[PDB]
Design a protein around this ligand. Structure first.
Ligand SMILES: Cc1cc2nc3c(=O)[nH]c(=O)nc-3n(C[C@H](O)[C@H](O)[C@H](O)COP(=O)(O)OP(=O)(O)OC[C@H]3O[C@@H](n4cnc5c(N)ncnc54)[C@H](O)[C@@H]3O)c2cc1C
Ligand SMILES: Cc1cc2nc3c(=O)[nH]c(=O)nc-3n(C[C@H](O)[C@H](O)[C@H](O)COP(=O)(O)OP(=O)(O)OC[C@H]3O[C@@H](n4cnc5c(N)ncnc54)[C@H](O)[C@@H]3O)c2cc1C
Ligand SMILES: C#CCSCC(=O)O
Ligand SMILES: C#CCSCC(=O)O
Lengths: 391, 393
């Protein structure tokens, strides 16, 4: 059969599979024992009470950017690195419209890797800083051009950045963008992981969005790719940043079934099911659990069990959103688990698209970060396991 | 179809370089007016920079700064303080782009109940001294942007007419907000039908927004001024720059168009606004101009362009709740410029607030926005009082 026929067919079949059909296997995989659920509720309660206790109970988003340049961002990272946080730097900029813009973004990433690699100073991919890139920044027609043209021009660029990251032994993560570019980005991940020029480096990383119906099947493909390539792929599990745009796009596409879930707790169930899959594959992937939701965090912390070492998995958060929560996580007296801060770098000329996504995240009534400040939402509701709502 | 309607259609994607010469000419003020406006603008900006207005005051992503109240009852109670200072209100029941019939029905009921509450609170103060309402057509039809324009207008007309009839019963203003460029024509057709509908005779509260970032703006205004004159309706015309610029650019880039329906340089929108303000100020007999802006230079220019004669009902300024108060506290009142300002006042929950908040973020966060520049240490007062006609190059 075609290479990985079964795994690839499962991804395509899930693309727009009816939401009601996607959920039952996720619910089962996300169901944890009463004893674990009780312990997780206690941890989530503590995290929420501590969050408010230490923070007395901005739209312009200056708090979301770590620096205007990589040199400035690296200087401002020393304090939290001393405490046990790590960083992933994001040179802001996406959706290049011209070939010249794509070349400028490439050069920004290239210079950033040199600076980050020098700052890392041999700390390696888990304890030291890394970089995150967006494929839409590196091809001028990313959303519109045929995959053959995008691949043939994007692959040499991404390979070159990955080689530089290998040379400094830092992480290089491909951020996940709109649903219609998942397939191309995954094909690119495969080619890079099988490229012998990158052998010996486990810093290649890839995001999977749990609001997407394909998420568990993409994870199956990635875990199998790790096994056959010999690369321990860093896998950032997120819920997803483009929900409002995906809903609008699917409506304008005339779709009867969308590529993302439309009930928020379904995304939560999907995230926990996929975390269970990742936690069973830590021999071949490095799970990175990106979330600001204290209930999600506590559920994964207890799911992962008592055995931990740095390099087994980590949590992640966004700069300007997650530090209060993760100050109750990192460190021996807390949960003794590491957290990597995603750290945007740039100016107003490149901040807009990201800030809009942060407003849609922070301003939505369904978001944990909004509900924690909502007087109508009890602590009981914040710590409730969403899997029990649909079980 | 008419010569005036044809001028609108022909301008839709007219090349930007062709649109500008007539706007530059119309936006050119005499030296005496320019000097007076520079003096007024400098005074306003010096006062603003003694305050802490602009984008830095936008508050948190909870959006608390931008919503007047959760219900119309709450919002009406909170309006008494600023009403006696010389402000009026236009209440906006938040909600837009209905996707289902149930949503469009809920938004209709929200608007209807707001009109009853606002009209009762107005207590016969009329359309200028008393509060009004603003509506979005996309809230009232479940496929506003995705269905054929003719059929959309036909189902929308009875609903908007029913709301207009309630507004007439209480003698309050009812304004149709302007949304995306591809729906200007439909909304303008609806306005014309309403203004020729004898059931609405004797009421001057029908209002309509025109966006100066659009290439059709002056020709829309010519059509509306003529419609007011021939129908006997003193149409309330809210002149804005526009709230959807980033989305219009993105759609136009995807549509593969060489020529967009909006200007692409901020200074061109500024020139367009001043040119269109000149057109409106020449037509105060038949339309009620409402100059919506937070830009102190724009305001000062219009204040001097309007001349010395003023009475309530001639024209007004407008601002958004949570953005315009620092500026307009230097405008309303007998100790200031003695001109009225109507506050656009969103009313709703956090849920219905999100889309409006995104447009406020794009407005407040853009380096090109007056409200961002007023707080920017790199931007001089000299730059803030520059006349757009004298800068454009
Ligand atoms: C370090 C880091 C890196 C990230 N990288 C990426 C990336 O590369 N690509 C990407 O797309 N996202 C990425 N994200 C995720 C995104 O930016 C949000 O931070 C994240 O989705 C919020 O989830 P949460 O668990 O913190 O919050 P929660 O409040 O628990 O979850 C909110 C999320 O639920 C989802 N949602 C909301 N409403 C609905 C609904 N009606 N139906 C279904 N789902 C709904 C959305 O995904 C929303 O963001 C990243 C996040 C972090 C912290
Ligand atoms: C009471 C009130 C009601 C309003 N109602 C509506 C409405 O119904 N519909 C609507 O669309 N808008 C409406 N607006 C306008 C919108 O919400 C903004 O408030 C307004 O455009 C900002 O203009 P300004 O003069 O305050 O600021 P300025 O800083 O002087 O102008 C900013 C504006 O310039 C324009 N712009 C920015 N960059 C560019 C560029 N590169 N090229 C071209 N133009 C550019 C945009 O329109 C932007 O909002 C309303 C505004 C107010 C105050
Ligand atoms: C968060 C993150 C990384 S990708 C989506 C975004 O930039 O918002
Ligand atoms: C402002 C205003 C009225 S219409 C556009 C928007 O709601 O942002």
């Amino acid at each position: 059969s075609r290479p990985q026929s079964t795994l690839r067919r499962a991804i395509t079949a899930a693309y727009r599979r009816p939401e009601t059909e996607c959920l039952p296997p996720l619910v089962e995989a996300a169901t944890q024992s009463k004893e674990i659920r009780d312990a997780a509720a206690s941890t989530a309660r503590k995290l929420i009470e501590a969050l408010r206790g230490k923070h007395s109970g901005s739209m312009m988003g200056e708090q979301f950017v770590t620096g205007e340049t990589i040199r400035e961002a690296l200087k401002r990272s020393k304090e939290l690195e001393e405490k046990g946080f790590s960083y992933s730097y994001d040179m802001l900029g996406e959706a290049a419209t011209t070939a010249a813009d794509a070349e400028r973004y490439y050069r920004d990433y290239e210079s950033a890797i040199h600076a980050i690699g020098k700052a890392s100073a041999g700390r390696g991919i888990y304890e030291g800083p890394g970089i995150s890139i967006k494929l839409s920044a590196l091809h001028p027609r990313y959303s519109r051009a045929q995959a053959a043209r995008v691949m043939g021009e994007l692959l040499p660029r991404v390979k070159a950045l990955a080689l530089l990251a290998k040379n400094y032994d830092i992480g290089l993560n491909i951020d996940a963008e709109e649903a219609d570019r998942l397939e191309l980005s995954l094909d690119l991940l495969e080619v890079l992981c099988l490229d012998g020029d990158l052998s010996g480096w486990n810093g290649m990383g890839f995001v999977v969005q749990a609001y997407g119906k394909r998420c568990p099947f993409v994870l199956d493909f990635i875990i199998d790719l790790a096994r056959r390539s010999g690369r321990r792929i860093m896998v950032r599990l997120v819920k997803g940043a483009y929900w409002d745009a995906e809903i609008k796009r699917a409506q304008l596409d005339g779709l009867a079934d969308f590529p993302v879930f439309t009930r928020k707790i379904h995304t939560d169930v999907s995230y926990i099911a996929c975390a269970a899959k990742l936690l069973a594959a830590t021999d071949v992937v490095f799970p990175q659990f990106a979330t600001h939701n204290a209930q999600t965090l506590a559920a994964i912390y207890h799911m992962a069990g008592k055995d931990f070492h740095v390099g087994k998995y980590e949590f992640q958060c966004l700069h300007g959103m997650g530090e209060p929560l993760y100050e109750e996580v990192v460190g021996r007296g807390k949960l003794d688990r590491p957290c990597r801060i995603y750290a945007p770098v740039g100016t107003h000329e490149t901040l807009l698209a990201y800030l809009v996504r942060r407003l849609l995240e922070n301003g939505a009534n369904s978001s944990f970060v909004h509900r924690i400040n909502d007087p109508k939402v009890s602590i009981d509701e914040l710590i409730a396991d969403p899997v029990e709502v649909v079980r």
